[PDB]
Amino acid sequence: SRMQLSEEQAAVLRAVLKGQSIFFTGSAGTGKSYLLKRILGSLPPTGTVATASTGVAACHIGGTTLHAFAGIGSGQAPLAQCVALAQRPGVRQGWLNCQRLVIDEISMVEADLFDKLEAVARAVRQQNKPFGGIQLIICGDFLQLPPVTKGSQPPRFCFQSKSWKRCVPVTLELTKVWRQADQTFISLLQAVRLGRCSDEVTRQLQATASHKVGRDGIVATRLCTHQDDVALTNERRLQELPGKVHRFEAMDSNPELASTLDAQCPVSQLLQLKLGAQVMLVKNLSVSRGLVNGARGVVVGFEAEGRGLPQVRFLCGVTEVIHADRWTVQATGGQLLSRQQLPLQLAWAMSIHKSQGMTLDCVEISLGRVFASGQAYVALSRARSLQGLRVLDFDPMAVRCDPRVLHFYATLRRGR
């Protein structure tokens, strides 16, 4: 075990191994990802179900989406219907065989959906205990973006559900800046997350507006709010370059489901590159050499023969030819599907949604406009340090947070 756990992280692990349902929570940069991986290595594979609310986060933990596991379609039908969908052959044994259920990215789950899931559990398993007697291991942070709904009315946070207190009797916090993160920058994030933008926070961010962050042909990625505008942007920037197009097609086990893999793993069926393309790594190839998720680079060549694989120069100081990697996704019903493709994305632009669970080493962020509660904090959390970041037109009016969620955190802090 490469690194020793902190006293706060050790407490979580203890509780989990005694069989207790627990929610653990804290800002970015407190070691939540490291702790999830240590929990999943410590538990028996048999009966342990790793899930996340998103595709992006599910892949980072080698699991599946909560939507796919559940098998209740959208969750919006009456209980008896949801319950009938969960009874379907493959979907049903997943519920029966689950002993411990890990759920990352809990901020994304709306309260009415948590309540539907909890009742579906008790019915399918014929067990009167909370969530059908499953040991729940829940990770996230409600000071992130609010949950989305389609349901016409306001969305409600997961902690407002009728079954939350019954299901989650112990909550523990991670508060210290983790040993793989920068003290100065995480301390600034922790102030922004609580809505608190002092004159010194505003100075430190405004001071980055003039920063040159790239070098050696690598330029900063512009962080954006919406995935579709991002794809058009990256495609237009690639079209402007004069080099010939190089195409890389995925090898899929089940090509009749490519759309599903496009939507759940971090790479597509077809990757196009040229000399000069701005790229981002999306697998951890080597932590010790800086080849981690979010590492920024530029294409500097292609192999002259064979498959013509790209040669990438990274900001971290590595130049290397990038080969195909593998991802496995679990479909509703349980079938394992696989995609082999290069672990690279275009990176003139990147959305907040597709960058969850990672940080970039070369990034530009615009924060003069007001966004939702938690938006300024979540965007700044995609950077690593003040050195790798340029903030345009920062305004402390950009910083808003949800007062109901602040009171939830203040109660937790008063405990200890």
Residue numbers in the entry: 203 to 618
What does the paper say about this structure?
The structures we report are of constructs from residues 206–641 (apo hPIF1) or 206–620 (the structures with nucleotide analogues bound). In the 1.44 Å apo-hPIF1 crystal structure residues after 620 are not seen in the electron density suggesting they are disordered. SUL1 is stabilized by hydrogen bonds with the main chain atoms of the loop residues from the Walker A motif and the side chain of the Walker A K234 residue at the beginning of the α2 helix, situated at the 1A–2A inter-domain contact area. Tight packing of this area is maintained by interaction of the inter-domain linker R381 (motif IV) with the carboxyl group of Q206 at the N-terminal part of the 1A domain. A second arginine, R584 (motif VI), interacts with S557 (motif V) and the carboxyl group of I554, contributing to the rigidity of the inter-domain 2A–2B contact area. We also mutated K485, N486 and N495 of the poorly characterised B (residues 477–486) and C (residues 494–499) motifs within domain 2B that are characteristic of the SF1B RecD helicases sub-family. K485, N486 and N495 are in exposed loops where a sulphate ion is located in the apo-hPIF1 structure (SUL2 in Figure 1B). Residue K414 was also selected for analysis and we also included the E307Q Walker B motif variant as a control. K414 is also in the vicinity of a bound sulphate (SUL3 in Figure 1B) and is conserved between mammalian and bacterial Pif1, but it is not in the ssDNA binding channel revealed in Bs and ScPif1 structures. However, a comparison of our 1.13 Å AMP-PNP structure with our 1.44 Å apo structure shows that the binding of the nucleotide induces movement of the Walker A motif (residues 228GSAGTGKS235).
